[PDB]
Structure to design on (343 residues):
């Protein structure tokens, strides 16, 4: 059973009488509830206390979509409801996916968040995007998630599979911590830390000291973070570590021209590339690497389906473009994006 009040825009400081008889009747009557969507409403303290008691009873709850549930609330008054909700979830043994994005978590709201994240061993997919964390709080999430690995390990719990944490200003200052968090979770399948303001030295460290140890990695998205030649050379080295890589997201990462050359040259050296999606939008990439890429895709990437090169430093009119297009045509599979905004 799936319960949703999504986008109902409810200013719930508490749970009324008919609001309890006409809104959360299913959540208050059904026990086999497997999903709960509270996204798009404002949850006050009292309401949170109500839901908590009606959520801890759902022993088969697996998905908790609680993104966007505190808009309008005073940042430092959210901790009580958060704690009440997260502590109720720690009682749901089959809860594998938790989403808490689009929620402003100040340093205070971070305590119950940290305790929960460090204790919920059944967690497999976490979504924590756009919470205004920052470097300080970012390392706290990292650190807590490292405690999760230990608890999971002692309890034989399933491994963490997804980690979506972007648009949270993690930047360079919390990268030594995440590297450690990825060392703790080497069975990860999806990782997305887009738009965090991470810079060259943080990208390099994160890739080589962290992600590189994640061999089951299928999807990696480091969209909108500064790579430069440094970060790029660090990727060129990490690549060989992900034999199961399917999607590599690198849009707006300013890999640089030589950066991109180094990255393309790394791929050329990998055999059996099961890669399907390659995003290289706005990376200051120039013609020469695209020509090299052209060959690499044709000879070394038989499963490619999506290629993004818009915004780079070569023109759609260069002959390599029609060459690429022809690789797809002949194969009958794969597509290039529209190059309408080149440099």
């Amino acid at each position: 059973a799936r319960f949703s009040i999504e986008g109902k825009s409810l200013k719930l400081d508490a749970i009324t009488t008919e609001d309890e008889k006409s809104v959360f009747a299913v959540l208050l009557e059904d026990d086999s509830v497997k999903e709960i969507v509270l996204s798009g409403n404002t949850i006050g303290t009292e309401a949170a206390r109500w839901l908590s008691e009606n959520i801890a009873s759902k022993k088969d709850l697996e998905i908790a979509e609680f993104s966007d549930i505190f808009t309008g609330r005073v940042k430092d008054e959210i901790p009580e409801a958060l704690r009440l909700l997260l502590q109720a979830l720690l009682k749901c043994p089959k809860l594998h996916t938790v989403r808490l994005s689009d929620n402003a978590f100040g340093p205070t709201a971070q305590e119950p968040l940290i305790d929960f994240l460090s204790k919920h061993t059944p967690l497999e997919h976490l979504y924590l995007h756009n919470n205004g964390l920052g470097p300080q709080a970012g390392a706290k999430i990292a650190r807590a998630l490292q405690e999760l690995a230990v608890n999971k390990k002692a309890k034989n719990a399933p491994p963490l599979r997804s980690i979506i944490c972007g648009r949270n200003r993690l930047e360079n200052g919390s990268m030594k911590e995440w590297a450690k968090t990825f060392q703790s979770h080497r069975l990860l399948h999806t990782v997305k830390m887009v738009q965090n303001g991470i810079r060259p030295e943080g990208i390099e460290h994160l890739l080589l000291e962290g992600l590189a140890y994640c061999q089951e990695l299928k999807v990696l998205d480091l969209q909108d973070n500064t790579f430069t030649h440094l970060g790029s050379s660090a990727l060129a080295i990490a690549l060989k570590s992900w034999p199961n890589l399917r999607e590599l997201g690198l849009n707006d990462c300013l890999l640089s021209a030589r950066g991109a050359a180094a990255v393309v040259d790394a791929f050329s050296k990998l055999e059996n590339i099961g890669l399907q999606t390659l995003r290289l939008q706005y990376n200051e990439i120039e013609l020469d690497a695209v020509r090299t890429l052209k060959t690499v895709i044709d000879e070394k990437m038989p499963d490619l389906l999506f290629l993004e090169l818009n915004g780079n430093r070569f023109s759609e009119e260069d002959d390599v473009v029609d060459e690429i297009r022809e690789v797809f045509s002949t194969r009958g599979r794969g597509e290039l994006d529209e190059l309408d905004d080149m440099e």
Notes: The longest strand covers residues 2-4.
